[PDB]
Amino acid sequence: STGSATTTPIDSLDDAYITPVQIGTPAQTLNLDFDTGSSDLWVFSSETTASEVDGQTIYTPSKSTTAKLLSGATWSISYGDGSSSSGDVYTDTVSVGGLTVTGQAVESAKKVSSSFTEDSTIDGLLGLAFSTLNTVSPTQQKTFFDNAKASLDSPVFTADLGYHAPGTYNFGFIDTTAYTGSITYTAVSTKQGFWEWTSTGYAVGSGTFKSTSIDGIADTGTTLLYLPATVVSAYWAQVSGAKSSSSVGGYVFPCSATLPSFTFGVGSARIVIPGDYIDFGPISTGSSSCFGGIQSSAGIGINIFGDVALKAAFVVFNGATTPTLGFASK
Q1: Please, are residues 43 and 24 in contact by the beta-carbon 8 Å criterion?
Q2: Alpha carbons 175 and 156: distance in angstroms, whole number
């Protein structure tokens, strides 16, 4: 089997992407944030504290003839950005882009943090990291991909995120029309539960390429590109007036600037992020200070190849017995 679904930016900055997901019988379609940096499929629901729901579409398990309480199971997650959610668990039928999994754990939120409430466009998350990170207790549950894997034509999914435009998540096949040149594959460590890999270096603009190993995670659920302070400083030094602002919480730059590109290495191959992808707009409405899309990972504890990086590529998440990651230009 295969599946193919369009993913759409939630706003004009590409802060996140939402993908429609069918849950239950008859289908309840919710727009979920597909997140290769976590492993829980959780939704706003009829059980979510009423004051914490503000415009989201909810899953109502009592209206699904295929829903079953997963008795005794609870979940609780905290994300790298400080947001969180928790609740109980149902199993139900879940379909993405025509690919159907029966008995998928659907984690129903009883509580969500304010950042989730405040984002009306995101009805929940669909985790695509390794199932070892799933938070359900006392019986850990499998991701949608893990459940689908054996049925797929090939045990892969691909992320093709758009810049200020829709893109595509495919399951079970590689669309050879969706990228240019060849796909370069690189080793993955699953030791921390992430799609963790090592970039071979970087360049800023038309500058020379610096060969250096940068361990990080491929994370569709993180907006920005978070890299070591040395790398980030080298980038912003090429933008007149750019500075790190402790009050704002990262590098800002004059909105009048033209940003240089940023290149990262994948083996001997190179992925070029155009300068415009690095612009996250005014820090507040009307400001002439703009927020940068490349930020320091210092104090995160890990480098994160988030959407800024991934949307410059066609990315293969190869879930074979020994997983790997592939990147192509597009």
Answers
A1: no
A2: 11
> Exposure string (b/e) for 197-217, b if CB count within 10 Å is 16 or more?
bbbbbbbbeeeeebeeebebb
- Our CA angle for 287, 13, 177, nearest 5°, is 150
Residue showing tokens 């070892």:
132
Q: Is 183 found in the same domain as 124?
A: no
The one-letter amino acid code at 263 reads T
Cα separation, 251 vs 138, in Å, equals 42
Residue 12, token pair as written in the block: 């004009």
Answer yes or no: do 197 and 262 share one domain: yes
The last residue of one of the domains, among 106, 141, 174, is 174
The answer to whether residues 170 and 159 touch, using CB atoms and an 8 Å cutoff, is no
State the CATH number of the domain containing residue 300. 2.40.70.10
255 plus 195 within the same structural domain: yes
The rounded distance, in Å, linking the Cα atoms of 218 and 303 is 9
DSSP-based three-state secondary structure for 318? strand
Q: Among all residues, which ones are annotated catalytic?
A: 35, 199
Reading the block at residue 259, the tokens are 């940003």
Q: How far apart are CA 141 and CA 40, in angstroms?
A: 8
Which residue in 89, 82, 171 sits closest to 134, CA to CA?
89
β-pairing verdict for 225-227 and 294-296? parallel
Q: How many domains, the chain?
A: 2
Contact (Cβ atoms closer than 8 angstroms) between residue 144 and residue 94: yes
Elucidation technique = X-ray
> Residue 75 to residues 70, 107, 236: CA-CA distances in angstroms?
11, 7, 40
Parent domain of 247 = 175-330
Are residue 130 and residue 187 in the same domain, yes or no? no
